[PDB]
Design a protein around this ligand. Structure first.
Ligand SMILES: O=P(O)(O)C(Nc1ncnc2sc(-c3ccc([C@@H]4CC4(F)F)cc3)cc12)P(=O)(O)O
Ligand SMILES: O=P(O)(O)C(Nc1ncnc2sc(-c3ccc([C@@H]4CC4(F)F)cc3)cc12)P(=O)(O)O
Ligand SMILES: O=P(O)(O)C(Nc1ncnc2sc(-c3ccc([C@@H]4CC4(F)F)cc3)cc12)P(=O)(O)O
Ligand SMILES: O=P(O)(O)C(Nc1ncnc2sc(-c3ccc([C@@H]4CC4(F)F)cc3)cc12)P(=O)(O)O
Lengths: 341, 341
């Protein structure tokens, strides 16, 4: 299991990441750096690390082993951690915006006592640490500027998607008319697919000298289609998954979210079916949640998902056959096997 | 008035800034871009634009007029606007953290109805726009990477200071023991001086080919000492200024802030004077505010400020005489004349 082999060394490298981001020439800022230590430890640790590890795995698959020295690996781990800090920045902030209670089975940072909206500044420091790391480890490298720009573009794309999400589903203002498929695909593309699929692979490519605009265009065609499928999967499993399988528990309906399900549900309705969803979707009560689930069931939406999963598997295989070269197909396929739940 | 000459053209260029940051190949994100237009217009417009204009004025003073073509000026205006967007990013967010009501005599963005904590994402888009602008206007230039890194370093330094501020004065937890001078100088240095004084001049230098580590070290020695003085000035004027002069009205005492005044006040106290400040500083009531002001008065703190202003003027002149070369002294002096209130 190629990801499980690399994990040990990756998660150990965190010690050094934090040591270096807090390494004492200016004793005056001690107290803020301490706080920075605390923010990293609480927010970068505890996930599965899929995105970060994809950098280290791709790097191994993309570089000639002759050219995989100790330095090269330190940089790969670091850039991997950069991806993880990006995620930490987004999540700290999104949890504030969504009024979330927990994240990874523990209290969101901003809910922790004495933190509150100070978390906004903490999220910003998380983003800042990316560019500090890139500079400490990669300034002298020929791909240095490509990475800076790739992280920046990835932040912008994610923010644009978050904006589009916030527009599509305002807390307190339940409206289903703007839960369209065109709109769903866009949110997923910008809000998750880009930084979760494209970014880690693309960081790997750059680090191995692969900076062709055509090569990157091709990786991206594949990786976006992948990330779309994997988000639709999570939406499905949110409801119809056993929570032993998932790890979450499915609040998408109480939270009035733009899930793939409710979208597809919306397309397959006599006018009278809409009124039941208007009535039930978003409410605290549990009997209400049940009537929504029963509804999606009586529209054989599993059958619709199953069909989507077939077609999607076929298309992605085709893409990989057509556009992976000159990359090894196992960079894409290994990712798919790792994220499939 | 060198700043008043450049203002017209600078503020007109905003039209183009916004046109370009919202310029339609991807119709799917229309709705988020619209929102981006709205965020820029509300948050980048309405200030004095000192920081932004310092880029355009310095550029004129630093480049040989032969080499000040139409392109060169577009880039100067743009980078100026980049500074202004940085400010917009910080202020949108700081207003959330401080639970501010108004900013520039109007409702803070996050208080505007339908915005709320969505403003966090909006602040982030403001930061993102800097790097989009830098790329659209400067990618091909030899100073491109220096600007990217300068903006990033400036964000980090500001955030670190904001962290140190948040630590020093927690809303709800009034403690004066950590309002020390060493701590005050640090907050000002990182939170304001760097990005308000050093950054705009340094962006100008880079754009004119001045990338020496020694030249930048020297500009910075001057500009930090300047920014320190100008913040101490604002603290003073917050209380002892006529508000016809200032434009603000002095809430620093109700808001339990780490002002230069309260700091210096703390150093000049029998133990019994502290108890009056413990008692009065931070409270809603007005009679309480008065007893604080009366206190600072009876410690001849104007006399202490006056002395500080003399010594400070002398030191800054000395710095400029010693370290401005090979820059023209009028870049520093013009800045001082523009910001002195
Ligand atoms: O037990 P499930 O996972 O629910 C089962 N699924 C499968 N069963 C046997 N082979 C495959 S191969 C496969 C699959 C793998 C990857 C992908 C997407 C393309 C990718 F890799 F991104 C899509 C479908 C699913 C799949 P079903 O729901 O089809 O009954
Ligand atoms: O009886 P098999 O079909 O061979 C069964 N397979 C599965 N069963 C229930 N869900 C999934 S999902 C799945 C799967 C996931 C990803 C992929 C493709 C390689 C990749 F990860 F892109 C192919 C198949 C297989 C798979 P087994 O492998 O446990 O024997
Ligand atoms: O009417 P105020 O402004 O209050 C008056 N101030 C001055 N009066 C006549 N010349 C100068 S030159 C001067 C000054 C200018 C710049 C600076 C700081 C160095 C810098 F430029 F950054 C410090 C002091 C103040 C100053 P006072 O408070 O000293 O009575
Ligand atoms: O009677 P003057 O001393 O000549 C009087 N000057 C001032 N009066 C009250 N506040 C200030 S603050 C001030 C000032 C500010 C900045 C500077 C130095 C050049 C710089 F902006 F660094 C020098 C003096 C002069 C100044 P005027 O200029 O209106 O005639």
């Amino acid at each position: 299991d190629v990801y499980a082999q690399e994990k040990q060394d990756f998660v150990q490298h965190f010690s050094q990441i934090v040591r270096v981001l807090t390494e004492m020439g200016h004793p005056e800022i001690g107290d803020a750096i301490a706080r920075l230590k605390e923010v990293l430890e609480y927010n970068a640790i505890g996930g599965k690390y899929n995105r970060g590890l994809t950098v280290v795995v791709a790097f191994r698959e993309l570089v000639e082993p002759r050219k995989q020295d100790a330095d090269s690996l330190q940089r790969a781990w670091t850039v991997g951690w950069c991806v993880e800090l990006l995620q930490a920045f987004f999540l700290v902030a999104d949890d504030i915006m969504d009024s979330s209670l927990t994240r990874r089975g523990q209290i969101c940072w901003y809910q922790k006592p004495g933190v509150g909206l100070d978390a906004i500044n903490d999220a910003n420091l998380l983003e800042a640490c990316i560019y500090r790391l890139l500079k400490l480890y990669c300034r002298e490298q020929p791909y240095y500027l490509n990475l800076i720009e790739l992280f920046l573009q990835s932040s912008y794309q994610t923010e644009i998607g978050q904006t589009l999400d916030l527009l599509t589903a305002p807390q307190g203002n339940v409206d289903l008319v703007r839960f369209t498929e065109k709109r769903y695909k866009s949110i997923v593309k910008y809000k998750t697919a880009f930084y979760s699929f494209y970014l880690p692979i693309a960081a790997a490519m750059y680090m191995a000298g692969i900076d062709g605009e055509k090569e990157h265009a091709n990786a991206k065609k594949i990786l976006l289609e992948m990330g779309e499928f994997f988000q639709i999967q999570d939406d499905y499993l949110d409801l119809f998954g056993d929570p032993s399988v998932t790890g979450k528990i499915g609040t998408d309906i109480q939270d009035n979210k733009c899930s793939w399900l409710v979208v597809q549900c919306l397309q397959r309705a006599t006018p009278e079916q809409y009124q039941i969803l208007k009535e039930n979707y978003g409410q605290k009560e549990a009997e209400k949640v049940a009537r929504v689930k029963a509804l999606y069931e009586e529209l054989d939406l599993p059958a619709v998902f199953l069909q989507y999963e077939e077609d999607s598997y076929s298309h992605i295989m085709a893409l990989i056959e057509q556009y992976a070269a000159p990359l090894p197909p196992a960079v894409f396929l290994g990712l798919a096997r790792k994220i499939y739940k």
